[PDB]
Amino acid sequence: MIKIWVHIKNGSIYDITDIVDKVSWSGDYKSPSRTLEFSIIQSSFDNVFQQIDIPIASTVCFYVDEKELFRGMIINRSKDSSSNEISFVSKDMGFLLTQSEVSYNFKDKLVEDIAKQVFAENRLSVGIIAKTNVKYTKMFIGVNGYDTIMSAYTEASKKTKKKYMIEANLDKFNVIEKGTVTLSVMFEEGFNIINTTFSESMENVKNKVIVVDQYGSKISEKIDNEIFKEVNVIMQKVIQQQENQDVDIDSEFNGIEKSCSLKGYGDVSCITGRGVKVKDSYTKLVGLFYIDTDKHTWQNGEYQIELELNFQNLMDEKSAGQDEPKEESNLGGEDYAGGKEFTAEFTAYCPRKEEGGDTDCRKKKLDPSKKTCAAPMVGKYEQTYYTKEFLNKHPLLNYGDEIQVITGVSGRDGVYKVNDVGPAITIEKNGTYHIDILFGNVEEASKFGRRKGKIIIGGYSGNVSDKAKIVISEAKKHLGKPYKWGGNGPSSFDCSGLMVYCFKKVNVSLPRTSNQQSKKGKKVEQKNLQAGDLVFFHNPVSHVGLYIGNGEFLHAPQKGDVVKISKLSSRRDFNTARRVL
Amino acid sequence: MYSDQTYEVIKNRTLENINLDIYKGEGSFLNNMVSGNNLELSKIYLELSKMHKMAFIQDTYNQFLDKRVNEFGVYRKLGTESNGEVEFIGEKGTVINNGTIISYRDLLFVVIKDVTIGSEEGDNSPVQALEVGKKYNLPTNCEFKLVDNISGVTKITNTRSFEGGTDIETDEELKERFYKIQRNQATSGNKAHYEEWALEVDGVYNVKVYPRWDGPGTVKVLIFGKNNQAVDTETIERCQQHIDEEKPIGPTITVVTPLPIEISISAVMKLEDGYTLDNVKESFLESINTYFRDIRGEIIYTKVMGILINTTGVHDLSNLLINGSTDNITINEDKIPSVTTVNFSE
Amino acid sequence: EFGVYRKLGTESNGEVEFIGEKGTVINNGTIISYRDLLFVVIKDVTIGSEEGDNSPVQALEVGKKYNLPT
Amino acid sequence: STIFPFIGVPEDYILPKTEELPIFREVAWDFEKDEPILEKGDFKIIEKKEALKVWIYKCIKTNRYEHEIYSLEYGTELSELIGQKYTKGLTESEASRFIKEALLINPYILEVNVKSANFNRDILSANVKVSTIY
C-alpha cells in the first residue's frame, strides 16, 4: 500500500494514487537531499483521460503502510505528445542548505554548537544533532553551510573514529552517525537475493605519510606496516601542518576497499546510512556492510531494491567479547551457608491476656508482622536428656537469632526471629524442634493447628570477597606511614598510592591518580557501601578513602598527616563511590 | 614445522634426493619401494608434536600430572564419605548391629554403632556413606530402606542433614594449589606470617599475636570476629589447625576468644511523671549495650552518666557508681564490658 | 614452574612546573606529552598558588626511554 | 573479522568448523499406554531413530489450529477428511499432501513418500516412508 498526495497553492489537496504509473525513491551519501520520481497517465487526444494539473513548486507526500517517508517540492515537469504520460521530479528539503553562503570565525567551539549556529543563522528546524566533545577552530569565507558542517564533523571524526551525515526527515534536520541502526533483515543467497557483484580494489591505497612545515620543508615521515604487508609498494601522501596545529599521521592511511552491489527484496527500512548483514554462501559466514546508495522502485505490482554496500568486518560467531549479564549470585541475602537443617514441629500462638505470656524476653507487646517465634532459649527449659553430646548435636538457640522456617504454607515460610517466650517449648529426644508460630487472631491459629515441618538455624557468612580481606589487612599494615605526595612505596604513600598498592596486591590495576580512579568500576551508593569500597568526596579527589564498613575508612589524609582511620560521616562532602573487586 | 611435514612433502623430497636415471612417478618400482615408510614418518611426526605438550606441567593430563606433582610432593586429594545419624522406629527390642547397611535411592550407608529400638540410650546410631562424594550429603526427612530385611524395624529416617561428603580434587585445582604453593614464600622470620595465616581462616577479622606469652618457645595468637567480637569454637579450631599447618618448627600456638567483663551500675535518680523504674531501666540497658558495642578500651564515667541522664523518662540523677566506684574501668585486650546487675532506686 | 617471574619495568616518575595565568587549575589526570612519550599529572595544581605550581608527573608506560633529562 | 571471503578465502585461513546437527535425543514414550517411561526412578532418554519415531507420533496425533500454544506450522489437517467430505481421489491427494507438509518441518527429516493407499469399508490405509540423516 503506497499513497501519494499533492498540495496545490490555492489550498486544494488531491489523492492521485489511482493515476500513478511508476514510482522511484533514492538517495546517496554524498548529497544532503533525497529524490522522488513518478509519472501519471494523462492524454490530450482523449477527453476522458484529461486530469488535473500539478504546477511547479507544489508539495508531494509519499506514504507506505500509513507511514510518511518523503515530503518535498516539485522541480521538473515534462510532457511528451506521443505518449499519454506526464513526468515529475521532486527533491527533499535538504537542498536549502547549499543555497546559504555565510562567513564565520570560529575559535575553540564545540562541533555541535557550530552545527546549531549554522542551522540557526538561516532559519531551519533541528530535530537532533549528534554529540561529540571535540573543539574546532576554523575561518570560513564564502563556504556553504553544508560544507561547513561536513568539514567540522570530519575533523571530529578524526578523533571519534566515526562517520557522520546530514539527513532531512520530513520538516526536521538531523545529524547522525552512520551504522548506529542495524536492520533486522538479512540478505541470504537462497532466500531474497536476485544478483550480487563483489569487488576489491587497490587504486586508492596510501601507506606513507610525510609532514611538511608551513615553509615546504619536510620534518617527519611514517610507514604503516600492516598495509605495506599487503602491497609491496610504497604510495606516499603529503600533508602540511601550520603553526597552531599538530596533525595526527595515523588517520591519513588508507587500505584496500571491498564493496558489493546487491539487488533483491527487502523493506523500506534499507536506506543510506544504516548497517546491513549479508551471509556468505560457501562458508556460511555473515558480514556487516554500510549502505552508501539505495534505490526503491514500484512498477507493475512488483517492488525491488538496489544497494551499494561497503564492507566493515566479519560478524563474530556467537559473541565476540561474550557480553554476559552481570548479576549477583543472590538477589537478596547473599552467602547464606552453614545452615544445618533440623526437622521441626509447628504450634500456633494466639495473644490472649487471660492465658498470659504475651510479653517477650524484654517484656514488649508482640507484633504479628514481625514473624517472631518461640524456640528453646539456653537456660529456659532444660530436661534430663539435654546432655552435652546432645546439646552439641542439637544446639539451643539464643535471643534475637534469625532462623528459616518452612511450614509448607504460602506466607508462613520465611526467616523467623527467636523473640517469643513459650512454656514447654523444647526439643524432643529424636531431635524434633518445637517452634511456635505467632498469629494475630484466633481463627488463623485454629486453622494452622499443629503441623510438622523443617527449620534452619546457624547459617550465615555475610562476606563480600576474599580479596577484600587482603586489601583491608594491607591498608591496616600501612597505618601511620609518613605522608609524601607522589610516593608509592611501602615507605611512604600519597592519597591514591595506598589503594594502588593494596589492589595491586590482589591483581587489581587502577589509575594512578584518584580522579581517574573515580572513573573505574561500577557505581556504588552511600547506602550500598560495603567493606573494600572506594569513597570520593570533593569535586577534586585530593584524597580517596578505602571504605572498610561500620562508617569507617582508611586513607592518607594529606601532607603532614599520617595514615589512619576516619569516620565517614565526618566527611560531609561525599560525591560518589566505586567498586572494583 | 611438524604440521607442514606431510606424506606428500616427505615423499617428494626423498624422490628428489635420489640420483637415478629411471622414471620416478606413481606406479614405478622406485616410487613403490620408497613409499610405505615415508607414510610411517608422517605418522611419527604427529606423536613427536604431542610429546612436548604432554611433557609440561600446565597440560599433563592425569597420570603424568600425578607423576610430576609427586615429584613436587603434592598429592591429589581424595574425597571423604559423609557422616550422619538416622533413627530406627519399630517394635521394641529389635537389635541393629554394626555393619548393617541402609539405603536411600541408589546410595548405600552403614550403621556404625549397635543400637536397640526402645532402649534407654536411644534409637539413633551413626551413619557413614559407603562411597565418597558430595552426592551423599542427603537432606533431612529422607526415608532410608534396609537392604537385608530385619524383622521389627518399620521406618528409617534422618533428623538432620548429612555432611562431610567430599569429591575428588580434579587436575585444575591441583595445578592451582601447586602454583600458589610454589609462588608463595614462607620464611619463619617476621611476625607477619602469623597474622597472615590467622587471616587465611574464614570468620576472623582482627588478629593480635603475643610473643613469649608463656615463656620461650610460646606464642599466643588472638583472633577477632566481625566487629571484633567473640568467635565460635569451630573458627578457633580451624584457625589453630591452619596455623599449625603453616607454622615452622619450634613454637607452640594457642588461640582463644574474648571474655565478657562483669559490670554493675548503681544510681539514685528522680523519674519524670508517668515513668516507672522498669521502663527507664530497659532504655538505659539498650543505650548502654549500644555504647559498649561502640566503646574501645577503658570505660568513661562521663559517658556513662550522660547516657543515664539522657534516658527517656528520667528527670534527675545522683550517686552513680560504676562497680562501686566512679573511676574509669580500663579494659584489657580480648575483653568486652557486659551489664550484670542494675541497682536503681527512686 | 620454579616460581620465577619476569619484570616488566617500572614507570618513570617526576614533577613538572606549570607557568601560566593565575587561577587556572590543572585537574588530576590531565595528560601531557613529550614527543612520542606521554605523561599524566598526579596532583591538582593551580598556577600562582601558595602551594606552588609544581605537580608530580608519572609516565604512562614502562621503559628506560621515559627516564627524561632535565 | 578481517578477511573478506566473498570472492575467495585465503589459503592460510582455516575454516572454524563444519555445521552439523547434534544427536537427536528425546524422552522415551510408550505408544500402547500414551505415557513417558520411567527407568530406575527417572525419565529414560533414547536417541536417533527411536526419538524421531516419538516425535513423528506426536506430530501426527495433533490437530493443526486447535491449540493456542502452537504455531500455524505444527499439526495436521487429517481431521477434515473424516466423513467423506471430499471424493475418494481428492481424499487420497489431500491426505498425502497433508502428511508430507506436516512432517517436513523437522530439520532432521529429509524426504517423505506416501506410496500405497487403499479403501476398505470405512478404513483408509497408507504406507509412509521417512528418510532421515541417520
Coordinates of C-alpha atoms in Angstrom, one line a residue, chain B residues 92-96 114-123:
Chain B
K92 CA 10.8 -52.6 70.9
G93 CA 13.8 -55.0 71.3
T94 CA 14.9 -55.3 67.7
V95 CA 18.7 -55.2 67.6
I96 CA 20.5 -53.5 64.8
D114 CA 25.0 -51.1 67.8
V115 CA 21.5 -49.7 68.6
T116 CA 18.4 -51.3 70.1
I117 CA 14.9 -49.9 69.4
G118 CA 13.2 -48.8 72.5
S119 CA 16.4 -48.9 74.5
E120 CA 17.4 -46.2 77.0
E121 CA 20.5 -45.0 75.0
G122 CA 18.1 -44.1 72.2
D123 CA 17.3 -45.2 68.7

